[PDB]
Amino acid sequence: MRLPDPYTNPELSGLGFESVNLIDNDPVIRDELPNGKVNEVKVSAQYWGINISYPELFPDEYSVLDAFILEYKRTGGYIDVILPQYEAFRVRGNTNLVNIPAGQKGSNITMDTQGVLTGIPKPGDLFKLSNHPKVYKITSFNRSGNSWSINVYPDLFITTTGAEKPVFNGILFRTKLMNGDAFGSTLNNNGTYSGISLNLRESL
Amino acid sequence: FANITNYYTARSFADRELKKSRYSRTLSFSLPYQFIGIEPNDAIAFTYDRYGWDRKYFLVDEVENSREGKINVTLQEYGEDVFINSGQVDNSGNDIPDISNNVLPP
């Protein structure tokens, strides 16, 4: 259920995001002490927010957008999103042959790549676990031959069962439309729709 | 005093209450989470140079925990002398026997 785009619909190029804004939200409670210490306490999940803006739209591509959005509203499903700036295939191989030991938790993953993978991740790559919709971001990476380790932000939302597999490619955010409760399109006498924008918040 | 009957004990306790009543001051402030585990009637020594206070002695009198961890407190002043009694004197000379409802014999 991808948000339609030029890669899916090169004919409808207007659907290419004019610009995108990615926000981390890390709700935290903090205070400043008179001795000049700072102290902070964390609760609740981090989440990714995304904002999208579109140019003027012609009626056809607009109708394709509405036909998507109303299908989403009727079904109550999720919106999948790709994010082109991270589309690089620097890691490849038989991902489903990798073994992740169970009981890893907290922010460090270690893997047996079994010598299978080729290439390496980079800081700022996206990373995902096969059985869970969350998107994480690589802070750091190390090798010891076939063994890899990566330190990842935010902290892991699950304990590893040992059935997980890593996913370095084709990561899609799963999101829903917090703006959607008052959605609507201006129509100008040019015959063109205007003022569309989307605010998305990941949801699990 | 509803539940006390040893005269000397009652007097020694009233002396406590009188001495305590001289120490009127109450003080309130907030503490960071590391001081967790405080309770009422814990003993605090407070030190603050601008007021000239130096191990000024207080008892904790109210506490409020919070989900974040920030602790509000209030202190009540006491002295040491609150807990010390004077001498007293034997009161045995007035053990009045309140006999009634009796008829003297011939």
Q: Residue B32: list chain A partners with CB under 8 A.
A: 33, 39
Data resolution in angstroms: 3.8
Q: How far is B57 from chain A (nearest CA, A)?
A: 23
> Do the Cβ atoms of A200 and A104 come closer than 8 Å?
no
Give every CB contact of residue A123 below 8 A, 6+ residues apart in sequence.
Answer: A138, A139, A140, A141
B32 vs A41: CB contact, 8 Å cut-off? no
Name the experimental technique: cryo-EM
Q: Please name the helix (run of DSSP H) or strand (run of DSSP E) that holds residue B11, with its range, or none.
A: helix B7-21
For β-strands A186-188 and A192-194, DSSP reports them as antiparallel
* DSSP codes of every residue in A127-141: EEETTS--EEEEEEE
Rg (Cα) of chain A, in Å, rounded? 20
DSSP secondary structure code for residue B67 in this structure: S
Strands of chain A, DSSP E: 19-25, 28-32, 38-42, 47-53, 79-81, 108-112, 126-129, 135-144, 147-153, 166-167, 173-177, 186-188, 192-194, 197-202
> Do the Cβ atoms of A86 and A34 come closer than 8 Å?
no
Could you tell me which of A154, A158, A127, A131 has the C-alpha nearest to residue A141?
A127
Give every CB contact of residue A76 below 8 A, 6+ residues apart in sequence.
Answer: none
Q: How many beta-carbon pairs below 8 A join chains A and B?
A: 7
DSSP secondary structure code for residue B61 in this structure: E
Q: Residue A34: list chain B partners with CB under 8 A.
A: none
Looking at the complex, does the CB of residue B69 fall below 8 Å from at least one CB of chain A?
yes
Q: Residue B33: list chain A partners with CB under 8 A.
A: 39
d(CA B8, CA B90) in angstroms, rounded, equals 9
Cα Dmax for chain A: 64
Q: How far is CA B48 from CA B31, B45, B51, B55, B56, in A?
A: 15, 10, 6, 9, 9
**Kindly report the CA angle at B40 between B36 and B41, in degrees rounded to 5?**
120
Q: Residue A29: list chain B partners with CB under 8 A.
A: 68
> Do the Cβ atoms of A117 and A91 come closer than 8 Å?
yes
Tokens of B24: 């009127």
d(CA A65, CA A4) in angstroms, rounded, equals 7
Rg (Cα) of chain B, in Å, rounded? 23
B68 vs A29: CB contact, 8 Å cut-off? yes
Residue with tokens 């190029």: A13
